Design a protein around this ligand. Sequence first.
Ligand SMILES: Cc1cc2nc3c(=O)[nH]c(=O)nc-3n(C[C@H](O)[C@H](O)[C@H](O)COP(=O)(O)OP(=O)(O)OC[C@H]3O[C@@H](n4cnc5c(N)ncnc54)[C@H](O)[C@@H]3O)c2cc1C
Ligand SMILES: O=CCCc1ccc(-c2cc(F)ccc2C(F)(F)F)cc1
Length: 651
Amino acid sequence: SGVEGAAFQSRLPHDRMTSQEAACFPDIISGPQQTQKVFLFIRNRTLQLWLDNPKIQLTFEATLQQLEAPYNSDTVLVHRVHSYLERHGLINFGIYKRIKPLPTKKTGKVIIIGSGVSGLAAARQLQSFGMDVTLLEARDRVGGRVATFRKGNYVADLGAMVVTGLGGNPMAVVSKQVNMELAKIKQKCPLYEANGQAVPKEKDEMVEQEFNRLLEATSYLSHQLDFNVLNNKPVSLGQALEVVIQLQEKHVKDEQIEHWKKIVKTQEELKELLNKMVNLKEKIKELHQQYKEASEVRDITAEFLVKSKHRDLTALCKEYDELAETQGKLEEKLQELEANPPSDVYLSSRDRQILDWHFANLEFANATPLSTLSLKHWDQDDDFEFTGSHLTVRNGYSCVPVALAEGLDIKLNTAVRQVRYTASGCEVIAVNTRSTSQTFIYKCDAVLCTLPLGVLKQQPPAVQFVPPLPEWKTSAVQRMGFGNLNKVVLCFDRVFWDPSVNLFGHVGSTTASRGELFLFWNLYKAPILLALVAGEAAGIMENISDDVIVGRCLAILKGIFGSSAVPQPKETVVSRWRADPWARGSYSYVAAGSSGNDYDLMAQPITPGPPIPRLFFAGEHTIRNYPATVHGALLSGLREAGRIADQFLGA
Ligand SMILES: Cc1cc2nc3c(=O)[nH]c(=O)nc-3n(C[C@H](O)[C@H](O)[C@H](O)COP(=O)(O)OP(=O)(O)OC[C@H]3O[C@@H](n4cnc5c(N)ncnc54)[C@H](O)[C@@H]3O)c2cc1C
Ligand SMILES: O=CCCc1ccc(-c2cc(F)ccc2C(F)(F)F)cc1
């Protein structure tokens, strides 16, 4: 609906106050119900005004003038609701034209570490709020793990490239603000085996159905039967899958055994039956010799003898023909059995390879081998997935952080090395990545750390904290997963693939290598193919040079399309996200022995000892309900900007 749709697009229930709103409006939530409904209408209506035109700042004044009677009479409540929505980044976020220009007097100094989407989104908010903000970025560009290759007409993303559903997604708004072209991903994903032969549609569907069954069985084991600890070790999804596959093969073999038993028993009965017929034919042969001697010789005792032999001899053929139809009733049962054997195996060798492709796909979506994922919590965020098809960024995802950086004070080539925070202020120490001799010392009232989890995990530490971070924070950093995923960009001068197909799969020959170049993406205006390296392959393939890995790509493509069809690429690009010192991997995952609560602990600010919080955290690894995505990075920056403004400017 209308105001209903605005709540939904803001990830809020249209008919209930959230717990956060209840915190900020206790007089409302404890007061009469009719005022609760007035509150919800004003909130939903204000969200609608913003979402229907997110290129323009929505002021309190303009909200008041577009509310209908009688809501435009409660000026104070409107202001309370508008101020709340703005402070937390539900309206007036991203890039939009200001109506009310910024104050020249800044209040409070914030240093933001890192200039990815979470740092940029927080910076824009803090600046909007009238604070003095500087971002320090170690790279020579903004965007972090949004990273687009651009040369001539060639565009290709080496970092994020997928926008998940638009329903509920804040990137829907940013996409409008930046005029980013999104294209829905077409579903057809043909698979080719290692010999290049396409997988018949029916078998692709059979195997995909098994994959879904296996996943559902792991989830039942985990949540209904509490199979989550394995000899005092947290069980991984990988471990659980292989056990469920093991039981399926065990069940196939048992049904084979029960079938071979039915065969053997039927064969035994057929054997004894023939034996019984042998003895009965020998009995008729013997008796028929006595019909011959009796017929040979006629008085009444001899004639009677013929009638008695003839009567018994027909009776013995009555016995024999009885056994004959029991013989047929068996033989047809035997024939039927050895014509309809149950499954010989659960998964043929080729079937298991195709199944391993779907596991590679799952290792892509989590950026890690399945043996590292928490069985219980790997999909702990799935209640928050957006509705709609997934899309890709046709003109390159870097358009979003480039535009978010407009008007911000950003120091590039500036690597933070130490972060000192005391009950009286903060100092950030950074070195210039071009003259390591050159050192800077930025004073500020608060620090917003958007360092990637991979950087926080680094040992020896890349960034030193003074005082060191609390044990409860370092432990969460150690527990949480930080994955890896890489891409090969192949730029050609002609299209030799199916232009109507966005995706196609290469089925690898072994389990261990299932993530090697398993998925190819056709996304761009120029003749460009992207190949993914996922799972165990991702980290290992970083040690292979660009040339050898491109060769392996071309071998795969020549296997699918033909030797003569695949030219040499004009240009190639190969990501190495784990080796990248400013990322150390691609995105977080819920590791066995972690949980969603570690994402909440990562988000918790640090307060210096004997006081107010000085050190704040954002980044994809700090947002429990939306981890490992660009929108989660964004929402985490909006959240921290609100928490920081509440602290230093007042709610
Ligand atoms: C290969 C790949 C595929 C992906 N798939 C997608 C996808 O399709 N869709 C999706 O939504 N998500 C995807 N993701 C994840 C998504 O890109 C990230 O979750 C998000 O971009 C992270 O943003 P961030 O602000 O948390 O961190 P970052 O973007 O990493 O930003 C942190 C910043 O800190 C900087 N920095 C590091 N060390 C220092 C230092 N010492 N001093 C100063 N600055 C420093 C970094 O250079 C960086 O700019 C993908 C990521 C990768 C790498
Ligand atoms: O190249 C980058 C892919 C990284 C990435 C990670 C997670 C999602 C995602 C997020 C969700 F909440 C639900 C489903 C998915 C997906 F299936 F796409 F992985 C999308 C992209």
